[PDB]
């Protein structure tokens, strides 16, 4: 909802931050990805 | 078998009394030296309805004697008591309707 608690919002931001791909420069020397509609955070 | 309805009552979960709008316990004045040896008069200020019970309740205001001030008591009203009446409670209170006397 629009109403949130600080900890809940920070957790949502952390999940968004972790949902990003592997950096390209790293890959030239990810499995734990989620979509907002398929697998729910439950947290 | 299973626990019967009568047995479930004593658990007191949903069988507690619905007492949300009750106005207070109906008790007459705690024994004082004024009651024991003489009389004390308090005036009935309102006659109200207690949702649980059918009997009306009289709000009797007494004047405190150990300190300056007033105390309010919830009495079960006897039929005939009216607002503005003065009730007398004690050993020396006269025998009239509304008064509290030793039996």
């Amino acid at each position: 909802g629009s109403i949130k608690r600080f900890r809940l919002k920070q957790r949502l931001g952390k999940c968004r931050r972790q949902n990003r791909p592997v950096p390209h420069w790293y890959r030239l020397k990810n499995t734990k990805r989620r979509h907002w509609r398929r697998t729910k955070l439950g947290l | 078998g299973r626990v019967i309805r009568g047995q479930r009552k004593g658990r007191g979960s949903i069988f507690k009394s619905h007492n949300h709008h009750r106005k207070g316990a109906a008790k007459l004045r705690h024994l004082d030296y004024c009651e024991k040896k003489g009389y004390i008069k308090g005036l009935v200020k309102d006659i109200i309805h207690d949702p649980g019970r059918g009997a009306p309740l009289a709000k009797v205001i007494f004047k405190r004697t150990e300190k300056y001030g007033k105390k309010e008591e919830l009495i079960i009203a006897s039929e005939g008591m009216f607002t503005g009446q003065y009730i007398s409670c004690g050993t020396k209170a006269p025998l009239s309707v509304g008064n509290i006397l030793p039996i």
Binding site: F6, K9, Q10, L12, G13, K14, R16, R17 | -
Partner: protein, 93 residues
Amino acid sequence: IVKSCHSKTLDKYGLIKYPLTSEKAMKKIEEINTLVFMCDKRANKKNIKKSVKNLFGIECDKVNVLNTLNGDKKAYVRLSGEHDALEVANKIG
């Protein structure tokens, strides 16, 4: 118990992270005389006011604050009309 190390309370270098330079923050400078800074989430209005005062010699009328989903705090600091945000932004880049 006594502490010998120097304080780990956040001073200005760490209270204020860096200025925001997105298109919105950029245009706010000219239009509404406001600088957009990015701060640690533990800053407050007073912290930001004092910190920008001691980081750049500018006071402000007001600071508005939001918490982003990226884990930091965005401060819209509206500069006093006595000076302008353009020269401060030119001084800092």
